[PDB]
């Protein structure tokens, strides 16, 4: 059938090429995020060590599983992401992490400065990936609030009060 | 009470009817998506048959989950579902699903198909929802983006390159 | 050696009035669910959250009693049909109204479908069970959770 | 770097004082909601009692856990939440819960009534929260959500039909 | 089209007042085992106590479940149970368990013969119940295998060579 | 150098009089759980799937109970009787009547039974506690679980 | 046979005095769960995850606390009073203050509370334990639970 | 009253011909887990993945059908043998190949073996439900078990 | 309203030394217990070897979370636990575990001993801690009860008739 | 930059043909040793039946697992295991377990004998598989570890004094 | 007494060589993983569902073993590297290519590149060894597990 | 045909050299287990939370290495002896001191404390592993968790 529609080939949502860029954008971030996250991980040392190296491995989770979900947004979408070390190194815009062990009060302020370079690409390219998507978007909010977080978690170390 | 209300009946947000019938809208092609996903799901035959059974499961899952949310969104709206199999089979917008046994690359592409008419219905329905309540469109965004990975995640077996 | 020499050793085929026999319990288990969910979101009334919560239940059991009978019903080389369409025209269960329902109608009006369920189930199980007992073994699952699911339904409703 | 920002120090997302009062007044009320809940369920007698005592707890559970989700995006967005006896007392919306035992009709009436008060706080702060944040404003679509159904679930035992 | 049936009260199926009794029998003497599993449980001394000990809360449980089962399966049935213990001590078909500390050796034999016994009343009324209802009768089934599985486990203690 | 030089250092043992005062607790506790059943079976009517639910509660928790009693009793050397005859012989809890039974009757009549087992378990106390504080421990574990359940059916009848 | 006659067996009913002091503990144990709860937002400065995570700990137990309080007063036929006013006007808790606070602050603030918590527990405690040993039981697991706490909290600010 | 008088009730006992008819049932079992294990490990070829993973499946299931019936002769004291030896010497399966195999050889030669296995189930069926009907519902368990596996291997090279 | 005190830096409840000192000699007992439980574990051969094998790690569970909760309690209670070897050997009252293997009836009896001395300690100084403080005696009410079940499980193996 | 290689076809290890056959000597034996567990797991009886009974079930696990185990590294190793019952049979070094029903005592004798035939072939092959790949000598050295865990688990029982 | 006198006992600590021969394992792990998931989301075709979730096993064990390998080399008082730059200027993987890409094809490329990983491993293996045979035993399970997903990926594309 | 004949197959049996050197490491196991769960107690000041908790992981390590020892012994025929006063005369570990530690003071004792017990299972590493690979892999695992516990402890007072 009465409502049934009579089409052997329905096609689904296809992201625009500007969509696809804006999501390959958040990618990149969430896997610098990740390996910059893990090498703080690593390397931190000094007053308050064990904190900060377990909250530095739930900050790499909840950057790996957004970077999977962006990538796989986009695939579901039609485009193709890109998270290969040589792409993620020349398009990140996220500062660069130093070398050798760093104590935990800078690693506190390096982490902290690294999860706001992340969220401020997704909040720059949310209102244009709402306008084309709501649900991606949405996937977006996620991101912020969970990153969002994990930067008040890490940076209330070092808050002088 | 200071700042506390004294009215003894405080009243609940009501769908308005068109609201409610959007809502149907959504509910049906979830069923039929679900009924037709374990047709298929039975009587899939051929080249990585176990792949297919097993995902066309994982699509019955959130197919299921999702009429579930929509229908009690319904209801605490204060709107009322149907998801009788006769209100089901004359008002779906889903291409029938054929009977017998079908290839794997059948399976695939008719789903597929299914999947995105299912997506296109919350997309159509989207915006007036929205409009009236962000709530639910917020529990339509996750019916998107999850049905579309489906949609991915079965496509892709296809797919020449 | 008391191996055997064939290469290709064939598995047990269903008859048509077999396949036939099981596609009756398949729609009457698929209808029960559809039915089942809706008298889930629709009850209201006394005593509202412990039916809103057993029907779901029943849903669970009937859901996983249809996957059991379609996918026997494909080992022993016989065609399923779930769909909506079929469903409907071929459910051997009175309808279930649209529309809120008390609590106490919905108890009646399911215990009747489920005990209808039943029926269409204890009506093939002796043909069943005369061409293959390990399928009218699956019957028996049913006819016992179902009933169970009646029992616990319908005690709402009994009067001393 | 090739795109890599060169700032050391890079700022999150600060919420603005009206922002923080509009989160403020849900927490208070959520909070409010989860003593009144409490309460309901020590004290409730009567037909049905169980299934309600049951319910109660689902619905201060839920209660709780949006709280801490508002009262910790506060403190991601720079805000400081205030969720002491006081405060909540001295601020909520919430009509007064009644000491004593109460019967079960009377308490579904009363806390149906003290959810709706609530979602009502959570709806008339909505648009200028989303205006703002769109994230913080998909935490309160969740909220809306939950809350909506166990009114639902706990409204539908009084409901003649 | 319509194969829908038209009767609004379609009943279940009745057991026979005989068949009632049956169960009843089945129902008396595994309540009976599961008392005196714990008392054996209890009072178990000597060589190998901490097997015996453990297998007879093992033999327990499957009792219990056993006797549930059943009870239920009368009322599913419109028969009426009754496991009150002055039922069960007039009725039973079990010897009495001695009082006491017992030997490892004599629970053994005592234990494996309050099995034998039980699944003998199982084993008597299996065809009339079977010719009655045979759903009923694969759950004599279960309870037949499982209760001779624990008679196996227990009485292997005490075989010799 | 504090090590002690014995080699067989004995426990501590209980008194038959201890020995009998948690054997008094011990059948009210089986045969509390013996009505529970019978009760979660039988009973019918009005709000029957959460009395139904709630009853198997009272049930685990009077088994567990039954079983820490006499394993106490036998930690301390003492031996338990727990059989049919026995339990019912000795048990000061007030026959369960056979038959279905409303959910109200079930809630007045299974609170009373609570109650009474309670009330065995407050008689014994003292003289328990003054043998051996440990094992009155368990016992106000047991009157603090038992009255909660008490509670928890009792309301269903309560009207304010 | 020693079965009792009373179709009508009544449960322990607390006095008054006995009502009130159990309210006295439960306000407190609401106070310090919901100031355990602004802590745990609003602690800043070294060492903020270890003490967060701890608070919510605290909080977790005081909530365990005043249910089962509460609860137990239910059953003995009392009547909890929780509410956000009642707990405002009577709770002996030193106001937790508003604003963020640094980790060594809130250790001190929150040691002095949970200390302030424990002593409320304490003075009632003979007088619950006189007239009912099983409440004074459970009274004696939360003066367990809250002053490990205490220690595990405290900890961070002890020199030497 | 009702108690029966004997010290020692003996349980049920097997027949000879009866332990013999599990004994075909139980090689066959042991067989199959082991060629399922062999297909496992040397299944290459287009989708090699699934039919890696369902086999272990399928031996997952013929492990616990072997246990099954060699505890359950057990139970009723006939006394199994699976040892290796017995195993090649008497089963009835067609030999696997040695060396790598195809995804698609192995879907055929798999499907044969469970078919020839369901088959010794459905030859002894009736003797065995004719002597012990609880025993035939273990074998119905297997014929449902195994035959749902040929299905789900089968399907692989079915074209339509 | 208000009942509120005023002061800032209100102490808990601390231990007078002899309570320190009761609590000291329990702990020791139970850490000596503990390693003695291993030992057996180890090096008991014999009839019902897996038994004790397994019932003697149940032992040393208990011990172990024993000792941890008398060792905090004393650290909540503002007193020092001493749980180092040379203390623990030093002082424990806990007769010596013979070298080498022992036979599963010796393994038995030398456990049994030495539970049944564990429990003497915890006895012997109960009313004096009970009298300063009963909370703390209601841990040893659990020590007692725990303990005194692991002696039953493990000496009911040389149990005769 | 660049360390990278530029082959488009990079192989994997292969073992020779002997490194094969050590790996398939070790493989036949522990299948053998399971399928004999599993003989002594249902046809033993008498003193101790129950722990046996479990022990030599978690034996079978520990084999079934190992043979896996080594077999897959066959595969991965571009070697061809046979685990055939007529090549198991054939070329199994076990001496072969004695028919019908065995006391406790004599199936810990037998089965602690086959336990050290199977570690025994192990050990042998070791140091040949060690000098062409320590990785599976590594794996070796776990089955010698548990299995002779399983040896002395079981063997305890018949040791004496 | 066989006490030690140190207050100050130091751990073992790797070479600079011993440092860098991990810092090679640890970016082609990194890599590998990094390319894993690019494979994981963008194969396409025949049985791709099988791909994309070994794929993600893959991704799993290797993020395990740049973990490992990484917090090794900071017990032993070396510093790891695991930043995008230094792993795409250091990493010895053929780098894997852009865009969707077919099973097949991505099934040769991943092989090849766990080859690849598998080789610099086996390469360090004997000069780690001979300084801390350890850490070797942890090299020992990556050459393993790699070696095992080598096999369960490239199978797929065996004839034969 | 390829059968053992012997009827007494003996295994492999540790020479009482190589069961003195699994003796030294267990005594040291279990001094560290002891002055783990003193440090774990006693452990107060800047973020005492942390490691009090981070402890009682590197307790649990040892005590599973320990069990884990002992239990090689005994599988290899060796005989452990874990006593108190046996471990106080033999392990080499520095004495941990009595009273309050300090956090920063708890981190460098302990530390000296893993390394003591990493020496000596590397000084008798190479005679075990002479005798049985077997065991001196055990030995690896521990040298492995050990100091990564050394680490995350020693961590915490580490300036850069
Ligand atoms: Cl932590
Ligand atoms: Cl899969
Ligand atoms: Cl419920
Ligand atoms: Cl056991
Ligand atoms: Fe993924
Ligand atoms: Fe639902
Ligand atoms: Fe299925
Ligand atoms: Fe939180
Ligand atoms: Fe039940
Ligand atoms: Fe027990
Ligand atoms: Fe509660
Ligand atoms: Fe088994
Ligand atoms: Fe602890
Ligand atoms: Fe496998
Ligand atoms: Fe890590
Ligand atoms: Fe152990
Ligand atoms: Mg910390
Ligand atoms: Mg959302
Ligand atoms: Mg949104
Ligand atoms: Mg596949
Ligand atoms: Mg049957
Ligand atoms: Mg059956
Ligand atoms: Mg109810
Ligand atoms: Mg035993
Ligand atoms: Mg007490
Ligand atoms: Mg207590
Ligand atoms: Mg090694
Ligand atoms: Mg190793």
């Known amino acids: ?29 969430l896997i610098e995020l990740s390996l910059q996250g893990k090498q703080a991980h690593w390397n931190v040392v000094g007053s308050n060590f064990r ?5 530095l491995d739930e900050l790499v989770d909840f950057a790996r599983e957004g970077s999977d979900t962006i990538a796989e947004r ?6 193709v992401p890109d ?7 020349a398009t990140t815009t996220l500062p660069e992490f130093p070398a050798f062990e760093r104590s ?20 720059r390219v949310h209102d244009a990936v ?5 649900s991606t978007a949405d996937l977006l909010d996620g ?6 977080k994990q930067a008040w ?3 209330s170390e070092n808050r002088k009060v």
Not at 12 to 27: C, D, I, M, Y
Not at 51 to 55: P, R, T, V
Not at 106 to 119: G, M, P, S, Y
Request: charged share 30%; aromatic share 2%.
């Open 1 to 29: 059938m009465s409502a049934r529609r009579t089409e052997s080939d329905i096609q689904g949502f296809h992201a625009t090429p500007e969509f696809g860029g804006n999501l390959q954008k958040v990618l990149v971030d």
């Open 51 to 55: 904190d900060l190296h377990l909250q």
């Open 74 to 79: 986009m695939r579901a979408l039609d485009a």
């Open 83 to 89: 998270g290969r070390s040589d792409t993620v190194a």
């Open 104 to 123: 935990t009060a800078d690693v506190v302020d390096l982490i902290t400065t690294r999860i706001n370079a992340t969220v401020d690409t997704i909040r």
């Open 130 to 134: 709402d306008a084309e998507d709501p």
């Open 143 to 148: 991101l912020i609030d969970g990153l969002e």
């Open 153 to 155: 978690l890490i940076r």
